[PDB]
């Protein structure tokens, strides 16, 4: 017998349509987060807060006091920039072969990712855009 055993058992309280709701705490602050948000840039202020959605934990990190923001493509691969953030929280645009502050240089500027010599290390990959070609701009590799 599942007479009883199928027997489904909601709760939508949420449903109701009577103040009956306990408003006890919350009442007259929502939450003390003075220092919380003041540890959230204060160097902004107020306004620039990163969204509590956003919550990168770095899975490669930023070293070097290079951060990679973005990449600016232009028309010729060697005009193509980098959009670099400093340690500082500086964000400039460097092109390829310019020596980036922290002790990195930018080798090559790809639309898929920057090569930079991380304190005299360096490190050659192949971008997933082309599988008949690994290697984009440069000398092609149709297998590696």
């Known amino acids: 017998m599942a007479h009883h055993h199928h027997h ?17 705490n919350t009442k007259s602050i929502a939450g003390m987060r003075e220092e919380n948000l003041n540890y959230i840039f204060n160097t902004s202020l107020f306004g ?3 969204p509590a ?13 290079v951060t990679l923001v973005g990449i600016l493509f232009a028309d010729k691969i060697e005009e193509s920039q980098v959009i670099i953030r400093s340690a500082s ?3 400039k645009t460097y092109n390829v072969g310019d020596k980036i502050p922290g002790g990195a240089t930018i080798k090559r500027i790809m639309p898929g990712g920057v090569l930079v ?5 360096l490190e050659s990959l ?9 290697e984009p ?5 149709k297998e590696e």
Do not use: C, W
């Open 117 to 121: 010599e991380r304190d005299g290390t």
């Open 137 to 141: 701009v440069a000398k092609p590799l």
């Open 8 to 24: 489904h058992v909601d709760d939508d309280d949420k449903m109701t349509y009577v103040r009956a709701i306990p408003v006890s």
């Open 48 to 50: 620039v807060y990163v």
């Open 89 to 91: 929280g500086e964000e």
């Open 126 to 134: 192949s971008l997933p855009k082309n599988d008949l070609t690994f």
């Open 53 to 65: 959605d956003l919550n990168e934990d770095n899975v490669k990190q930023s070293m070097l006091n």
